[PDB]
């Protein structure tokens, strides 16, 4: 008769890392890092994004002639833009607080264009101005959302216009100021010099004076156009007054839907799929708490770490080898993790200890859940733009993001490295504890063999082996025969 | 005769969380999170705060006629300001670099008001101007710390004034520029058009031009007043020159005491209590690392986390059931953690080991003290204000704060879980070591019963048990009759 | 004859820290913190730094008459500046976006000075202006890289000048505007009132108007000079136009070499040594992962923490005491860590177990390397400069730096403590495992003595002892002899 205690082994080739040892083969493992994407851009939560194409944000809002598709834009989930868009400000110039506007458009999901100042209301000016830079079919043209006021005959009266925000939400209004090349242009266009442009609301007041100078030619013109924007609150009035050089707005953008969005810089094209997490390289369909695809994610997504391998051990060490756990594992005990092997006269087979296996299984599952179900990630549509005179702010942002990434990478790496040690020691501690429990139950009626096995002095049938496995071993009832056989 | 090794059990209820199991009942536990406050705004370190009431900082520093109780204010610990104050600027307008001023006030604890430009020195202008927007008892009035200069007769000379800072500390000076509504109001107030206001110091030069335009009416007026501020250094001079539209100062604010203060946005009122850690919801009185009351605190305030429960286990696992440490804990052993139970003919009672319990106590205490005392933080204010043209900066600050708090939350949770697991394993290891030491010392004169209890072969008296409990047991002394009784 | 199991002890007095114990003596330990520097400023990677002296960045770039040794500056690795430079703008004034220029200079390692507008091209103006503040040898002078334009006779024609960037890289250009003290000197210098200065590129437009006002006298003069800078891209043109008050540039700075550099604020001089990291207090020649000299460094440098000591335990617990291991360590085992001691008829002596010692050594080395070789050492927390109106941004930078530095200090301390505890427990477990291995192999043939020492029941000679040492012990061979001696 003989009973042995050992652990389960199989043909797995999975490896882990530990703070003491490297490349340790295990029976089971769980990868908690995602490294695969579909390489495609598609709909987030069922709502397609806003594809700008070769246009820019300023070109879309101002109404570039070469962006006529984006004049009635439906709802969107995120905005796709190119790094160096071609269709941009048609007339050379600038755009004040451009980055602030782009940041505002990261929490806006829909716009509704209202006509606030109709073109025909300017009955004392000429409103059919154009330029060769912004040309369609050879003929000169201009922005579709702005009006260029010019003299009607040799006189340019004071231009006055107002609008009361009775739409139902905040409104985005853009106006421009013209900077000619020479005094001859100013006289030919506005008939007077020393002009001003004045825009004022209940919070904003602004005066601008045209500045005439010879400039390097961009797009073939030495003139420039400067654009500014404001955010009009509900039930508030905006006032325009100018003696010249005013590029008035004809449409106002009302914020219809708010939420979480962002601008994602790609060179790609929308395709047909759905997703819940989006990266500039592709979508992610995963449930693990880590990934290393791309830092700039849009939507609820797993955390980003700069790691190539994060594997958690959920099984025993694979040391293949009748002996017991001192020699190695068993490749025939496919019922659990810790078990026995009886060798009596009426049979020779393996088994599993249900209680210890269940306890260890619950512990490992709880550990995996605790490591996984402890990280809280919000929407976090990161990504901000800074101008060429804001380099310190850009460096600050970059340093903050990199610092947090390094902190989290170190945290995750060391956590996995320590917990793999803990589980690998937990398993052999459990095996030794089971061996000690069996030895304490058996007392001196058996004979330790040194390889993890026990040799019985009394002939033990299958029922007595079952009693030993359960825990109801009756030492006194086999005591006398054991003594007689041992003393002999 | 028997001797057993076991541990202590009681009727405790406190639960802890480990990394392998959840809701483990323990004998002793320590809470390292505080969630209670008195809901009252108190005096920090015995100095009452500054109750602005319905006034803004601009109203206090400019002399709003209805904020007349703040003309002379004593020392303060922090400033309490409502979220939307209602007496800020009776005359509509703007304050330049307002948030910078509010940040500067976070390091100032006392102001002394010094008359720098007396109102009677302007002997060539009119200094009694007023408006209905700032009205007292119905009659028109104006700010109490500023002077409005107006034509005396049908002429307006150049207004010149200077002050040399011979006070003893840095000075704060506020001036303003008036922007009228129409040309008639400019002519009826300053008699000339095309005026300027020039303010200059050794490190500052600034010239402003009045703006005349029709604007929407706020408080019944279409005109605006724009205010600016500067910090005058010691032994430095400030010059004022204006041909119109100047709202000159009369008082300057000198920084008397410097320190660490802050602005708290609350709607409450000050009560009679003393406090070292103040939050917008109440006061904290605790000696613990973490809390979960409010992020924006002021004072020597404990660390902040987003967790609801952080309990450290400083005791044994509570499992009740004469058996030993295998079958569970003991409810009769009251004077220690580990111990022995013995049963002679001359007595049957409990005991407790001293060296082992003392070592365990010292280790647990050192662990708790290390976790508590490594977290070193100081007193600083975390509130910052940003304007509506600075939203990227606001998002940067918000993201940095949130990220740091999530990092510390993760650190605290992992620390507590892993340390609880290690402590609960440490207790079992200590008990097993005690059992092993006793067994090694007793050698073969005894017989293991398998439930942690040892049964002697020879008769053992009280002195023998006292000898086996401390580490001096004479195996040769009882060897011979132990053999005689065993072999029988 | 007996065989015993014990561990190594020696005369080291090194101490390490543990999460459960303080000041624990260990046989071997490794220090991973560097606290020493050579107290010198010298060459970084073979390139000497730029010694400004009493110069300033603006004084060097403008051509201060006393800042005359840096008119032809070779390659540099970092810039050494003083906290309060004395040779600075000799004509009083300001410098717009100074901190942005200083930030840009942190990524440029070489400049080349190109004559873009020769001083002889101004044939219709006077170009020999000077001031007593900006003085050499008593007689008046001016900056050496700028031209002051003044009327030639009683006439100031329209100044005009352009440059096309055909150099090869980006160019930095600085110009200035003069702000006089009174109308008399404006007329005596520029012959007209109501002047302007226009500078324009393909991406920059600017118009400035002089400000005439009496000002406090700094450096003896009541007038000021305001300077501005731009970054001209390749194949781009800059246009200058002025009717007065223009300080035109004569040279432009080409960015010859780019890289990683910085500005270090010290008060010392350059000496003759060669380093790889540089701190304001000295230089570091180390390979350790950490240091605590100064937060601001330049070069490949270890991480900075607020720690007084960080020592990793790589040895056993020094417990000086043949007994074995229950009583203490051995001072005679000079070979390895764990070993045996035999005492038979032939002789006595110590030995060492090669397998256990090698396994433990490899594990400890792997742990040390994992702690050290997991910290991202790319660069450090650079030093940024902010103005007096950017206090909020400076506070943000300071708080982020402090938060990250605190987080890393806490992480390193807790890592060291927990690793030390686990190392000591690891050594204890290894010794116990060796003891249990020998006991299981030897079984009943021996009797245990209770202090780590086994006594045989037969004659175990040198062949026997070498057999037991390397795990090949024939229990059947001596079974009958052991039974004979045991039973009797
Ligand atoms: C490992 O054994 C399993 C049997 O459970 C088998 O399905 C699998 O294919 C084997 N793996 C390899 C690589 O042969
Ligand atoms: C572990 O395996 C990797 C291959 O994935 C190898 O580069 C590395 O050297 C191995 N380490 C050890 C200790 O065998
Ligand atoms: C704008 O309209 C609202 C209601 O539609 C009205 O209360 C408000 O007075 C109007 N604004 C002005 C300046 O009249
Ligand atoms: C632990 O106990 C708390 C009691 O507040 C309960 O809410 C929670 O669900 C319990 N968790 C488990 C895993 O039993
Ligand atoms: C201001 O007063 C100080 C004396 O406290 C004097 O030294 C200084 O010259 C004065 N400033 C001016 C501009 O006269
Ligand atoms: C604060 O707690 C201490 C206990 O340390 C107590 O003595 C004191 O009365 C408490 N004060 C208040 C205001 O609760
Ligand atoms: C410790 O012992 C070593 C022998 O290897 C010796 O070289 C060293 O000087 C000793 N140190 C002290 C402090 O005794
Ligand atoms: C450890 O040693 C240091 C210096 O020798 C001493 O200040 C400290 O009190 C000691 N701590 C303990 C627990 O002995
Ligand atoms: C500047 O020079 C480049 C080539 O040297 C030329 O292509 C460009 O047209 C020039 N710029 C102007 C404004 O002529
Ligand atoms: C610097 O450290 C190196 C170790 O790589 C050493 O060889 C060299 O002598 C050291 N130089 C000085 C000046 O300390
Ligand atoms: C073990 O040592 C004995 C010496 O008694 C030697 O004969 C045998 O070859 C050794 N075996 C191994 C595996 O080193």
| C6 neighbors C319 (Cβ within 8 angstroms) | no
**Which residues does residue A454 pair with via DSSP β-bridges, in sequence order?**
A3, A448
C22 CA from centroid of ligand 8 (Å): 7
Ligand 5: atom nearest CA of B237 is 13
CB pairs under 8 A between B and C: 76
Kindly state the tokens that stand for B196: 């300027």
Pairing mode, if any, of strands C237-242 and C159-164? Answer: antiparallel
Tell me which long-range contacts B399-408 makes (C-beta under 8 A, separation of at least 24): B399/A400, B400/A400, B400/C396, B400/C399, B400/C400, B400/C403, B401/B295, B403/A400, B403/A404, B404/C403, B404/C407, B405/B295, B405/B304, B405/B305, B405/B306, B406/A376, B406/B306, B407/A404, B407/A407, B407/A408, B407/C407, B408/B303, B408/B304, B408/B305
Judging contacts by C-beta atoms under 8 Å, the chain B residues touching residue C179 are 205
Ligand 11: atom nearest CA of C467 is 5
C467 lines ligand 11 (CB under 6 A): yes
Nearest residue to C2 (alpha-carbon basis) of C332, C329, C445, C355: C445
| C101 neighbors C228 (Cβ within 8 angstroms) | no
Alpha-carbon distance B143 to B74, whole Å?
21
Tokens 């949770």 identify what position? Answer: B413
Q: Which of A20, A214, A215 sits opposite C366 (nearest CB)?
A: A20
Tell me which long-range contacts C364-373 makes (C-beta under 8 A, separation of at least 24): C364/C314, C364/C423, C366/A19, C366/A20, C366/A21, C366/A22, C367/A19, C367/A20, C367/C419, C367/C423, C368/C30, C368/C312, C368/C314, C370/A19, C370/A417, C371/C32, C371/C289, C371/C312, C371/C415, C371/C419, C372/C32, C372/C289
- Helix (H) or strand (E) holding A434, with range, is helix A391-442
Strand order of the β-sheet with B205-208 is: B159-164, B237-242, B197-200, B205-208
| A15 neighbors A249 (Cβ within 8 angstroms) | no
CB under 8 Å to B151, separation ≥6 — which residues? B125, B126, B189, B190, B191
SS (H, E, C) chain C: CEEEEEEECCCCCCEECCCCCCCEEECCEEECEECCCCCCCCEECCECCEECCCCCHHHHHHCCCCCHHHCCCCCCCCEEECCCCCCCCCCCEEECCHHHHHHHHHHEEEEEEEECCCHHHCCCCECCCCEEEEEECCEEECCCCEEECECCCCCCCCEEEEEECCCCCCEEEEEEEEECCCHHHHHHHHCCCCCCEEEECCCCEEEECCCCCCCCCECCECCEEEEEEEEECCCCEEEEEECCCEEEECEEEEEEEECCCCEEECCCCCCCCEECEEECCEEECCCCCEECCCCCCEECCCEECCCCCCEEECCCECCCCCCCCCCCCECCCCCCCEEEEEECCCCEEECCCHHHHHHHHHHHHHHHHHHHCCCCCCCCCCCCCCCCCCHHHHHHHHHHHHHHHHHHHHHHHHHHHHHHHHHHHHHHHHHHHHHHHHHHHHHHHEEECCCCEEEECCCCCHHHHHHHHCCCCCCCCCHHHHHHHHHC
Q: How far is B168 from chain C (nearest CA, A)?
A: 19
Kindly state the tokens that stand for A190: 């506005």
Nearest residue to C319 (alpha-carbon basis) of C421, C416, C428: C428
Residue B153, judged by CB atoms within 10 A of its CB (0-12, 13-18, 19+), counts as exposed
Contact of A22 with chain C, judged by CB distance below 8 Å, is answered with yes
CB under 8 Å to C143, separation ≥6 — which residues? C62, C63, C64, C65, C90, C91, C134
CB under 8 Å to C471, separation ≥6 — which residues? C437, C441
Pick the CATH number of B48-271 from 3.40.50.360, 3.90.209.20, 3.90.1720.10, 3.40.50.10860: 3.90.209.20
Write out the CATH class of domain C49-265.
alpha beta
Alpha-carbon distance A262 to A49, whole Å?
10
Phi, psi for C279 (deg, rounded to 5)? -115, 160
C13 lines ligand 8 (CB under 6 A): no
CA B48, B54, B60, B64 dihedral sign is negative
**CATH fold label, A49-270:** Hemagglutinin (Ha1 Chain); Chain: A; domain 1 (3.90.209)
User: Which residue ranges have their beta carbon within 6 Å of ligand 4?
Assistant: B 22-23
Tokens 């406190």 identify what position? Answer: B14
Neighbours of B183 (CB within 10 A): 10
Tokens 């000295």 identify what position? Answer: C282
Judging contacts by C-beta atoms under 8 Å, the chain B residues touching residue C392 are 99-100, 103, 384, 386, 393
CA atoms within 13 A on the CB side of B262: 19
Contact of B35 with chain A, judged by CB distance below 8 Å, is answered with no
Kindly state the tokens that stand for A162: 């107002």
Alpha-carbon distance B452 to A440, whole Å?
9
| A31 neighbors A310 (Cβ within 8 angstroms) | yes
Query: Which residue of chain B is at minimal alpha-carbon distance from C219?
Result: B202
| Per-residue CA distances from C187 to B256, B291, C192, C193 (Å) | 45, 69, 6, 7
User: What is the distance between the terminal CA atoms of chain C, rounded to a whole angstrom?
Assistant: 18
| C225 neighbors C58 (Cβ within 8 angstroms) | no
Taking an 8 Å cut-off on Cβ atoms, the answer to whether C216 and B205 are in contact is: no
Compute CA A331 distance to the chain's CA centroid, rounded to the nearest angstrom. 43
| Per-residue CA distances from A344 to A348, A350, A353, A439, A455 (Å) | 6, 12, 18, 18, 10
Kindly state the tokens that stand for A475: 């030492």
Q: What is the DSSP letter of A158?
A: P
Q: Is A96 helix (H, G, I), strand (E, B) or coil?
A: coil
Nearest residue to A48 (alpha-carbon basis) of A355, A252, A275: A275
Phi, psi for B187 (deg, rounded to 5)? -70, -30
Kindly state the tokens that stand for A259: 């939420």
B216 lines ligand 3 (CB under 6 A): yes
Kindly state the tokens that stand for C398: 């300071």
Alpha-carbon distance A282 to C31, whole Å?
46
Ligand nearest to the CA of B42: 6
- Give chains near B: 3+ CB pairs under 8 A: A, C
Q: Is A231 helix (H, G, I), strand (E, B) or coil?
A: strand
Alpha-carbon distance C340 to C346, whole Å?
16
Alpha-carbon distance B473 to B444, whole Å?
13
Tokens 């590129």 identify what position? Answer: C201
Compute CA B198 distance to the chain's CA centroid, rounded to the nearest angstrom. 44
| Per-residue CA distances from C26 to B274, C11, C365, C370, C418 (Å) | 50, 9, 16, 21, 16
Alpha-carbon distance B349 to B370, whole Å?
38
| Per-residue CA distances from C407 to A4, A267, A404, C368, C413 (Å) | 50, 39, 10, 21, 10
Ligand 9: atom nearest CA of A217 is 13
B290 CA from centroid of ligand 6 (Å): 18
| A162 neighbors A203 (Cβ within 8 angstroms) | no
Kindly state the tokens that stand for B451: 């439930």
Strand (E) positions, B201-345? 205-208, 224-232, 237-242, 246-249, 251-258, 263-265, 270-275, 277-279, 282-284, 290-291, 298-299, 303-304, 311-313, 338-343
| Per-residue CA distances from B146 to B247, B252, C392 (Å) | 6, 10, 28
Q: Where are the alpha helices (DSSP H) in B298-391?
A: 355-374
Compute CA B45 distance to the chain's CA centroid, rounded to the nearest angstrom. 14
Write out the CATH class of domain C2-32+310-487.
alpha beta
Interface of A with B in 236-275 (CB under 8 A): 236-237, 239, 241
Nearest residue to C341 (alpha-carbon basis) of C321, C359, C360: C321
User: What is the distance between the terminal CA atoms of chain A, rounded to a whole angstrom?
Assistant: 18
Identify the CATH number of the domain defined by range B2-35+288-487: 3.90.20.10
| A213 neighbors A222 (Cβ within 8 angstroms) | no
Alpha-carbon distance B21 to B473, whole Å?
41
Pick the CATH number of A3-35+286-487 from 3.30.565.10, 3.40.190.10, 3.90.20.10, 3.40.50.2000: 3.90.20.10
Q: How many residues comprise chain A?
A: 488
CA B50, B55, B57, B63 dihedral sign is negative
Phi, psi for C198 (deg, rounded to 5)? -115, 125
Kindly state the tokens that stand for B131: 């408006």
Neighbours of B94 (CB within 10 A): 17
Neighbours of C140 (CB within 10 A): 14
Phi, psi for A22 (deg, rounded to 5)? -120, 145
Alpha-carbon distance B280 to A388, whole Å?
40
Nearest residue to B171 (alpha-carbon basis) of B114, B228, B117, B226: B114
Give me the residue spans of the domains in chain C: 2-32+310-487, 49-265
Tell me which long-range contacts C256-259 makes (C-beta under 8 A, separation of at least 24): C256/C109, C256/C110, C256/C111, C256/C112, C256/C169, C257/C75, C257/C108, C257/C109, C257/C110, C258/C107, C258/C108, C258/C109, C259/C107, C259/C108, C259/C109
Alpha-carbon distance A317 to A332, whole Å?
16
A164 CA from centroid of ligand 3 (Å): 6
Contact of A400 with chain B, judged by CB distance below 8 Å, is answered with yes
Taking an 8 Å cut-off on Cβ atoms, the answer to whether B399 and A396 are in contact is: no
Alpha-carbon distance A290 to A304, whole Å?
6
Alpha-carbon distance C285 to B375, whole Å?
31
Strand (E) positions, A300-437? 303-304, 311-313, 338-342, 349-350
Q: Which of A391, A392, A450 sits opposite C441 (nearest CB)?
A: A450
| Per-residue CA distances from B430 to B5, B325, B360, B473, C417 (Å) | 11, 11, 8, 21, 21
User: What is the distance between the terminal CA atoms of chain B, rounded to a whole angstrom?
Assistant: 18
Tokens 């440098």 identify what position? Answer: C301
Chain breaks in chain A (C to N over 2.5 A) after: 321
Nearest CA, atom 2, ligand 4: B23
């Amino acid at each position: 008769d003989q009973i042995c205690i050992g652990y389960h082994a199989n043909n797995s080739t999975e490896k882990i890392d530990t703070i003491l040892e490297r490349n340790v083969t295990v029976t089971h493992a769980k990868d908690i890092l995602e490294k695969t994407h579909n390489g495609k851009l598609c709909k987030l939560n069922g709502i397609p994004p806003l594809e700008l194409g070769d246009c820019s944000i300023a070109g879309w809002l101002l109404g570039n002639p070469e962006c006529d598709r984006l004049l009635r834009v439906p709802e969107w989930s995120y905005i796709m833009e190119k790094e160096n868009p071609r269709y941009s400000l048609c007339y050379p110039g600038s755009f004040n607080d451009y980055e602030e506007l782009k940041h505002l458009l990261s929490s806006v999901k829909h716009f509704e264009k209202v006509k606030i100042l109709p073109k025909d209301r300017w009955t004392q000016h000429t409103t059919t101005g154009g330029s060769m830079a912004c040309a369609v079919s050879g003929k000169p043209s201009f922005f579709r959302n702005m009006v260029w006021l010019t003299t009607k005959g040799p006189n340019y009266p004071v231009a006055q216009g107002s609008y009361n925000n009775t739409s139902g939400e905040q409104m985005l209004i853009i106006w421009g100021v013209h900077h000619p090349n020479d005094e001859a242009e100013q006289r030919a266009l506005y008939q007077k010099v020393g002009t001003y442009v004045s825009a004022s609301t209940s919070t904003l007041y602004k005066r601008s004076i045209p500045e005439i100078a010879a400039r390097p030619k961009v797009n073939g013109l030495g003139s420039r156009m400067e654009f500014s924007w404001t955010l009009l609150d509900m039930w508030d009035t905006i006032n325009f007054e100018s003696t010249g050089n005013l590029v008035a707005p004809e449409y106002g953008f009302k914020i219809s839907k708010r939420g979480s969005s962002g601008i994602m810089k790609t060179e790609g094209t929308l395709e047909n799929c759905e997703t819940k997490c989006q990266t500039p390289l592709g979508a992610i369909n995963t449930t693990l708490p880590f990934h290393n695809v791309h830092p700039l994610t849009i939507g609820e997504c797993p955390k980003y770490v700069k790691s190539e391998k994060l594997v958690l051990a959920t099984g025993l060490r694979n040391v293949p080898q009748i002996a017991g756990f001192i020699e190695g594992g068993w490749q025939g005990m496919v019922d659990g993790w810790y078990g026995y092997h009886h060798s009596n006269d009426q049979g020779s087979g393996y088994a599993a200890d249900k209680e210890s296996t269940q306890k260890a299984f619950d512990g490992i599952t709880n550990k995996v859940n605790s490591v996984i179900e402890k990280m809280n990630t919000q929407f976090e549509a990161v990504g901000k733009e800074f101008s060429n005179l804001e380099k310190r702010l850009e460096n600050l942002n970059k340093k903050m993001e990199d610092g947090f990434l390094d902190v989290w990478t170190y945290n995750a790496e060391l956590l996995v490295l320590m917990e793999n040690e803990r589980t690998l020691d937990f398993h052999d501690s459990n095996v030794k504890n089971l061996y000690d429990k069996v030895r304490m139950q058996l007392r001196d009626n058996v004979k330790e063999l040194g390889n993890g096995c026990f040799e019985f002095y009394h002939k033990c049938d299958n029922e007595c082996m079952d009693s030993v496995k359960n825990g109801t071993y009756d030492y006194p009832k086999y005591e006398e025969e054991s003594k007689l056989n041992r003393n002999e």
